[PDB]
């Protein structure tokens, strides 16, 4: 997913959507969660990966 011109990859799980929202989950059981900056890591710019998507990532507590 692309947020602010950067690419974010999951830490342990996959990205899924029910049609209107995006979550993360483990690969062997259904247990959604809201994407934050704690369960993902960033690397590179946003013009290489194929199939990237536009969404938003929420900062847990530092700025709020």
């Amino acid at each position: 997913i692309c947020h602010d011109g950067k690419a974010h990859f999951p830490r342990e799980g996959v990205f899924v959507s029910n049609g209107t929202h995006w979550f993360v989950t483990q690969r062997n059981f259904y247990e959604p969660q809201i994407i934050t900056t704690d369960n993902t890591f960033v690397s590179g710019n946003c013009d290489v990966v194929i199939g990237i998507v536009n969404n938003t990532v929420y900062d847990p507590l530092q700025p709020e």
Binding site: A7, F9, S43, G44, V48, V49, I50
Partner: peptide, 9 residues
């Protein structure tokens, strides 16, 4: 890691 594969497909 994954980005290694995704950046050299």
């Amino acid at each position: 890691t994954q980005n290694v594969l995704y950046e050299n497909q």
